[PDB]
Amino acid sequence: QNRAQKLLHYLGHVMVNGPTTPIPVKASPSPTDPVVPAVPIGPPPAGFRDILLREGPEGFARAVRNHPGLLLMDTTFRDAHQSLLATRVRTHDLKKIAPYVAHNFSKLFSMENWGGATFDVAMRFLYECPWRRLQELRELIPNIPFQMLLRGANAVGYTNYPDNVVFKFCEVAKENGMDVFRVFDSLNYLPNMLLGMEAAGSAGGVVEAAISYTGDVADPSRTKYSLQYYMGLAEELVRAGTHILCIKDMAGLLKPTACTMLVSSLRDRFPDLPLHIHTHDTSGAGVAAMLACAQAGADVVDVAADSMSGMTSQPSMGALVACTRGTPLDTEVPMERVFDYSEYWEGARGLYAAFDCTATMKSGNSDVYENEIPGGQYTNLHFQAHSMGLGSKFKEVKKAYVEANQMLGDLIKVTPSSKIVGDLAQFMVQNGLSRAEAEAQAEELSFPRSVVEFLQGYIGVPHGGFPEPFRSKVLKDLPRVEGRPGASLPPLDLQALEKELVDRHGEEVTPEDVLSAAMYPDVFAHFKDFTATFGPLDSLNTRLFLQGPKIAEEFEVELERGKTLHIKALAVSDLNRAGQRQVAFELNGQLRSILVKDTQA
Amino acid sequence: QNRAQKLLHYLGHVMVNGPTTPIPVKASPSPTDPVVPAVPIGPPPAGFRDILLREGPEGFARAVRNHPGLLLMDTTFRDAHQSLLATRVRTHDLKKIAPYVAHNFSKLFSMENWGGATFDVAMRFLYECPWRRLQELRELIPNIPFQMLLRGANAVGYTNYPDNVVFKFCEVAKENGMDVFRVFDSLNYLPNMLLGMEAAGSAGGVVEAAISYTGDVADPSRTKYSLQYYMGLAEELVRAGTHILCIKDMAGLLKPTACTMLVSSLRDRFPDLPLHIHTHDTSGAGVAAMLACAQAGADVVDVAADSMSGMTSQPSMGALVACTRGTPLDTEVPMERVFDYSEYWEGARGLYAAFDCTATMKSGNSDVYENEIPGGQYTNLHFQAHSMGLGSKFKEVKKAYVEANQMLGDLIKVTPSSKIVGDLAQFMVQNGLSRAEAEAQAEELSFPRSVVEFLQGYIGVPHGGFPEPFRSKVLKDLPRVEGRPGASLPPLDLQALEKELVDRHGEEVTPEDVLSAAMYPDVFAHFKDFTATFGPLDSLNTRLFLQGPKIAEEFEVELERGKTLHIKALAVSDLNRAGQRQVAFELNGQLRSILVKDTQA
Ligand SMILES: [Mn+2]
Ligand SMILES: [Mn+2]
């Protein structure tokens, strides 16, 4: 077995040289293994994915809109760990509790488990294939709809790609098993949001236009992104044609009062339009928030498993289900099941001890109502300062964030945008620049590549326009983008890229691989060469994958399905073998050894 | 200076032999120092403590009941850290942010900062005087009311004390600066609750009778502790005379729905009675819950600073303040201030890294709706299991907890009671006893000392009676307590105890000390001998206290107020000096050395 030995070499390697992917927090994966509940044999109870197929996104939206109780979505597979564990959860652990979900959470609206950071991190850090993840799970959960976070601007990539790809991406994603597409734009720049809605709607999937939330519509003071701001935007999005409408409060800024307001005026304007609410518990509301949303007529709300909820993540699924039963919005989900599910996750999370923000973050923070830093980014900046004894610092950067944000014309901060305000915020602090010093001396300073490209609109056009008195003194003799960036981009010959990959990585390369390579040229490449020589490192349980094997400890890995592979380390030490070393394993009935390179560790 | 050298010897000792008080989690106190905001010079803005004094608990309650916005209480000084940090926060760090509080949180209803575990821990583990704490803080915050958790049954002790002490306790406490007394009974056994109310009322303080909450009044299924159960209990407590009425949801089981119900029928029955709600965010509601209580007419709700809220503690103060502004329930508290306040606590908590439940607990858990384990006990049992790689176990015990509780007739689990179900739950588990095996074999097994005395009523009589078919087969030829246990207890000759202490510890012993010794004979004794030889270990900053000083690191300690004491370690090594060693400090302008005992460390 070449599949076999490829992995051995790997295990051996991690033993000799240690961890392959970065480990931000010095900690070994919990020695305990996640508790996987029991599940009856045979097919799931069948939930919405069934209806969808049976009637399209058409009847779907209706059933959704006409469902009595509150409906939910599980972000535990995507945004939940993307916010708490540096989006490091591996397919392996996701496949584990999959059969459970399929059997227990059929009443489920959708299940977020793809899109977002994941596509990137899957190759850049976990060395697994994002497509495999999908197919492997779609296989395990045929009854629950699959949702992803798609960026209208550029699918799951980091830069503008020709529009021919956005459609081909969704085309594939759709066939591979994706259903609901949540398209968003960091500036709510419709052009990008509609392109996303296109590829998604044309791919034949469910379009769920997502509006990113800033400030507080309840507060009449601020008028930039006023209630009427959103309301207008919806019209366009609804006209452009969307099955479901979602409100992406990525910063956990939605207050109950603001909620009641927003949703009602929305339910009023669109009586039978499905409404989906996404918030992060960063401020401390979330639950109280979501509850208000239902009250006012919201159809669904995003939640995460208790053990993976709270703080920069989504509100406690169990708290929502609990507070909602006995009422006309009852979710009808057995508390018992949320327990076993959270149970699993509390243990699963134990493996990702090396990526637990829990190291620096011991709770939420209402100051988010001031800096407007989204959940994910919050956690990271927090960890950064504190991880280097600089909590004192964090206060300061947060203030530079506000100024930076105001300095660019008060913005909507999400992946694209949010990270540009970040660099500028840091640029100012690390250079001691008051907003005034920053603006006045703006005629010439080396502002972040991200900031300059933003003002050139590479992403889009901020509502209210660019801070021109400043924008120009910055841009100078620089090319300012005109129109939807992706527009002026010539297509991407897929055959040129296709044989260009077959020619190299193999006669294997699949449509999927092509796309991946497309979005992530290098990262994909590296990911391919790595797995090339190390086998299916994705079938390895997280512990072995991170920490590597323990000398003498018996263990097994399910390669494919006909093999179980029982291995036990025991023996390494050839300290000098021509500048190397050699380890031996007792693979199944026999035994063998692979040679590693000490890398003078 | 004897004050001086006494501390030196201590510091040195810690250097040579290490930590004096147990340290559950191996971690050193953060090297960063909590950020203490700025506070104007001169007197605070004055709040309710002022009104109180000017009009007695009579005008106070009215003002409370007639105040427009929602009122709050800060448990950050007591229940917040008692649930999260093993009640280990020191007076030193409480004095620091005190002036700030006095200046910024005048609108505050009360401030919980005393009572509960504190009195015990203050001597048992921190080696500080609980009275000192009170006096020192009363000094720093003369404008905000001081609240404490007083146990009707036995003030701040662990056993039945003759009622003469219960009155003498509140008498002293009241004069020392305590105002509002929250009196509670673990089984809501009126006899004990009234005794507390008396001492509290008689002492001339504000009586806030507390009803302990269980189950879910919204849920018609369970009828033991039905709505009409509480409603009736209210009548008694109000007739017995109480200025304010509080609901102690020590387990965080209060759902919004159950809330709206409870409070309203309460505000209905008592139009102008002040209502105070206490909850723990354990389930995930809390905030959502409290918001409901207000909606329905609740006058005050307990909260903690953001960095100290969440999980088994109280809801995010900032989340409440945030979601409540702009509405008729506006707290009027400047978001800005809750920020600086949490800012301070996030850092102060970094000093207590050795007691942070954060180590095992990374979030709340809605399964609380099933085991009914109060916030504090949850945290402990969770740390327990997991701190010894036994999370797998924790599930099990939670199950025994339910059976144990059901086995004792379904109870209200708070400090007294709650820990009895604990022992029983663990007894069963650790002896493999189904609730059936536990009961049938009850005729004779060595049930916990706590469980036996419970059935003998040493605490009180459980509503619905004791589980007799069992109770008896357990008790056998054992004495069953008749009436409020404290009643049958002969007074406590205070002079006998007074001269008894003077005679020993010194001609210093104060009325306070007497009471302390009373409730905590030994603990007090040890606490006294320790401080006796080591000086004011309470004027030491938590870092030096826990971790001791760092060789060559310059530092200072504010002994009293006329001395600043600048010390620098540097030099220890007399490894063998007659089985000891010797360290040297460079105290202020001069230098000197103290001789320690290596304890063959
Ligand atoms: Mn999000
Ligand atoms: Mn409590």
Name the binding residues of A for Mn(2+): 79, 248, 278, 280
Q: Is-contact B52 B206, C-beta < 8 A? A: yes
Mutate to test the interface with A, among B366, B371, B398 (most CBs of A within 10 A): B366
Helix B287-295 and helix B317-324: axis angle, to 10°? 40
Q: Is-contact B275 B267, C-beta < 8 A? A: yes
Question: How far is residue B408's CA from residue B402's CA, in Å, rounded to a whole number?
Answer: 10
Cβ neighbours of residue A399 closer than 8 Å, sequence gap 6 or more: A371
| Pair type for strands A71-74 and A300-303 | parallel
Question: How far is residue B342's CA from residue B78's CA, in Å, rounded to a whole number?
Answer: 15
Q: For residue A66, give the nearest of A351, A273, A316, A360 by alpha carbon.
A: A273
Which chain B positions have a beta carbon within 8 Å of A329's beta carbon?
none
Which structure tokens are listed for A222? Answer: 């601020």
Minimal CA separation from B59 to chain A, in Å: 33
Nearest CA in chain B to A32: B389
Total residues found in chain A within this entry = 601
Which residues does residue B72 pair with via DSSP β-bridges, in sequence order? B301
| Pair type for strands A110-115 and A300-303 | unpaired
Phi, psi of B584 (to 5 degrees): -130, 140
Which residues does residue B183 pair with via DSSP β-bridges, in sequence order? B150, B209
A392 and B364 in contact by Cβ < 8 A? no
DSSP classification of residue A87: T
The CATH architecture to which A492-535 belongs is Orthogonal Bundle (1.10)
Q: Is-contact B82 B116, C-beta < 8 A? A: yes
Nearest CA in chain B to A314: B284
Question: How far is residue A541's CA from residue A91's CA, in Å, rounded to a whole number?
Answer: 9
B347 and A319 in contact by Cβ < 8 A? no
Nearest CA in chain B to A35: B392
From the list A284, A347, A350, which residue is nearest B315 (CB)? A284
Q: Determine if residue B228 is labeled as part of a ligand binding site.
A: no
Cβ neighbours of residue B597 closer than 8 Å, sequence gap 6 or more: B13, B16, B17, B579, B580, B581
**Chain centroid to CA B99: how far?**
22
Q: Is-contact A287 A294, C-beta < 8 A? A: no
Cβ neighbours of residue A477 closer than 8 Å, sequence gap 6 or more: none
Q: What is the dihedral of CA A64, A66, A70, A72, to 10 degrees?
A: 0
Which structure tokens are listed for A586? Answer: 């007792």
From the list A256, A322, A350, which residue is nearest B255 (CB)? A322
Fold for the domain defined by A67-355: TIM Barrel (3.20.20)
Q: Is-contact B555 B549, C-beta < 8 A? A: yes
CA of B417 to the centre of ligand 2 (A): 14
Domain boundaries along the sequence of chain A = 1-31+536-601, 67-355, 356-476, 492-535
Residue B542 host element (H or E): helix B542-547
Q: Is-contact B492 B161, C-beta < 8 A? A: yes
Q: Determine if residue B435 is labeled as part of a ligand binding site.
A: no
Question: How far is residue A346's CA from residue A352's CA, in Å, rounded to a whole number?
Answer: 10
Kindly report the CATH class assigned to A356-476.
mainly alpha
Which residue in the block uniquely carries the two structure tokens 């007197």?
B43
Phi, psi of A566 (to 5 degrees): -105, 115
Question: How far is residue A298's CA from residue A275's CA, in Å, rounded to a whole number?
Answer: 5
B288 and A287 in contact by Cβ < 8 A? yes
Q: Is-contact B34 B345, C-beta < 8 A? A: yes
From the list B289, B338, B356, which residue is nearest A366 (CB)? B338
Which chain B positions have a beta carbon within 8 Å of A343's beta carbon?
395
Ligand that lies nearest to the alpha carbon of residue A314, given by its number in the listed order: 1
A489 C-beta neighbours (distance < 10 Å), count = 15
Which chain A positions have a beta carbon within 8 Å of B389's beta carbon?
31-32
Q: Is-contact A524 A535, C-beta < 8 A? A: no
Which chain A positions have a beta carbon within 8 Å of B322's beta carbon?
255, 283-285, 366, 369
Which residue in the block uniquely carries the two structure tokens 């007639």?
B66
Minimal CA separation from A95 to chain B, in Å: 21
From the list B257, B285, B363, which residue is nearest A306 (CB)? B363
* CATH assignment, A1-31+536-601: 3.10.600.10
Minimal CA separation from B298 to chain A, in Å: 17
CA of B315 to the centre of ligand 2 (A): 12
Largest alpha-carbon pair distance within chain A?
76
Q: Determine if residue B423 is labeled as part of a ligand binding site.
A: no
Which residue in the block uniquely carries the two structure tokens 């329930």?
B329
Helix A521-534 and helix A494-505: axis angle, to 10°? 30
Q: Write out the E strands in A360-512.
A: none
From the list A257, A347, A395, which residue is nearest B327 (CB)? A257
SS3 B7: helix
The technique is X-ray
B185 C-beta neighbours (distance < 10 Å), count = 27
Rg from Cα positions in chain B: 25
Minimal CA separation from A323 to chain B, in Å: 6
> Which one-letter amino acid corresponds to residue A48?
F
| Pair type for strands B275-278 and B244-248 | parallel
Q: For residue B205, give the nearest of B189, B223, B182 by alpha carbon.
A: B182
Nearest CA in chain A to B283: A319
A444 C-beta neighbours (distance < 10 Å), count = 9
Minimal CA separation from B234 to chain A, in Å: 25
Which structure tokens are listed for A82? Answer: 């993307």
Mutate to test the interface with A, among B76, B351, B362 (most CBs of A within 10 A): B362
DSSP classification of residue B229: H
SS3 A316: strand
A318 and B392 in contact by Cβ < 8 A? no
Which chain A positions have a beta carbon within 8 Å of B327's beta carbon?
257
Phi, psi of B72 (to 5 degrees): -130, 175
Question: How far is residue B465's CA from residue B450's CA, in Å, rounded to a whole number?
Answer: 18
Q: Determine if residue B425 is labeled as part of a ligand binding site.
A: no
Residue A332, phi-psi category: left (phi > 0), alpha (psi -120 to 50), beta (remainder): left
Residue B247 host element (H or E): strand B244-248
Q: Give CA separation, A195 vs A184, A276, A481, B268, B476, in Å.
A: 10, 21, 17, 57, 80
A31 and B362 in contact by Cβ < 8 A? no
Question: How far is residue B125's CA from residue B21's CA, in Å, rounded to a whole number?
Answer: 6
| DSSP states of A4-71 | HHHHHHHHHHHHHH--SS--SS-----SS--------SS-----HHHHHHHHHHHHHHHHHHT-SS-E
Question: How far is residue B210's CA from residue B237's CA, in Å, rounded to a whole number?
Answer: 9
| DSSP states of A144-210 | S-EEEEEETTTBTSSS---HHHHHHHHHHHHHHT--EEEEE-SS--HHHHHHHHHHHHHHT-EEEEE
Which residues does residue A581 pair with via DSSP β-bridges, in sequence order? A596
B38 C-beta neighbours (distance < 10 Å), count = 8
Cβ neighbours of residue B94 closer than 8 Å, sequence gap 6 or more: B77, B113, B133, B137
CA of B74 to the centre of ligand 2 (A): 12
Per-residue b/e over A78-114, b at no fewer than 16 CB within 10 Å?
A: bbbbbbbbbbbbbbbbbbbbbbbbbbbbbbbbbbbbb
Nearest CA in chain B to A368: B339
Nearest CA in chain B to A337: B367
Question: How far is residue A11's CA from residue A20's CA, in Å, rounded to a whole number?
Answer: 10
B356 and A362 in contact by Cβ < 8 A? yes
| DSSP states of B94-131 | HHHTHHHHHHH-TT-SEEEEEETTHHHHHHHTS---HH
Question: How far is residue A329's CA from residue A306's CA, in Å, rounded to a whole number?
Answer: 20
> Burial of B250 by CB count in 10 Å (0-12 exposed, 13-18 middle, 19+ buried)?
buried
CA of A78 to the centre of ligand 1 (A): 9
Q: Give CA separation, A143 vs A65, A205, B434, in Å.
A: 19, 16, 38
Which chain B positions have a beta carbon within 8 Å of A219's beta carbon?
326
Which chain B positions have a beta carbon within 8 Å of A358's beta carbon?
358, 362
Q: Residue A83: CA atoms inside 13 Å, Cβ hemisphere, count?
A: 32
Rg from Cα positions in chain A: 24
Q: At what resolution in Å was this solved?
A: 3.0
Q: Give CA separation, A378 vs A303, A361, A404, B136, B320, in Å.
A: 19, 10, 15, 38, 21
Nearest CA in chain A to B324: A257
Ligand that lies nearest to the alpha carbon of residue A379, given by its number in the listed order: 1
Cα–Cα–Cα angle for B221, B379, A323, rounded to 5 degrees: 35
DSSP classification of residue B387: H
A288 and B323 in contact by Cβ < 8 A? yes
From the list B310, B319, B367, which residue is nearest A285 (CB)? B319
Helix, strand, coil % over all residues of chain B, rounded to 5: 45, 10, 45
Phi, psi of A119 (to 5 degrees): -50, -45
Question: How far is residue A393's CA from residue A396's CA, in Å, rounded to a whole number?
Answer: 5
A507 C-beta neighbours (distance < 10 Å), count = 6
Residues around ion ligand 1, judged by CB within 5 A, are A 79, 250
Minimal CA separation from A397 to chain B, in Å: 14
Q: Determine if residue B278 is labeled as part of a ligand binding site.
A: yes
Minimal CA separation from B243 to chain A, in Å: 31
Q: Residue A515: CA atoms inside 13 Å, Cβ hemisphere, count?
A: 24
Which residues does residue B115 pair with via DSSP β-bridges, in sequence order? B149
Q: Is-contact B12 B594, C-beta < 8 A? A: yes
Which chain A positions have a beta carbon within 8 Å of B382's beta carbon?
none
Question: How far is residue B363's CA from residue A16's CA, in Å, rounded to a whole number?
Answer: 36
Which chain B positions have a beta carbon within 8 Å of A363's beta carbon?
306-311, 316
**Chain centroid to CA B228: how far?**
30
Minimal CA separation from A367 to chain B, in Å: 6
Per-residue b/e over A300-324, b at no fewer than 16 CB within 10 Å?
A: bbbbbbbbbbbbbbbbbbbbbbbbb
Ligand that lies nearest to the alpha carbon of residue A281, given by its number in the listed order: 1
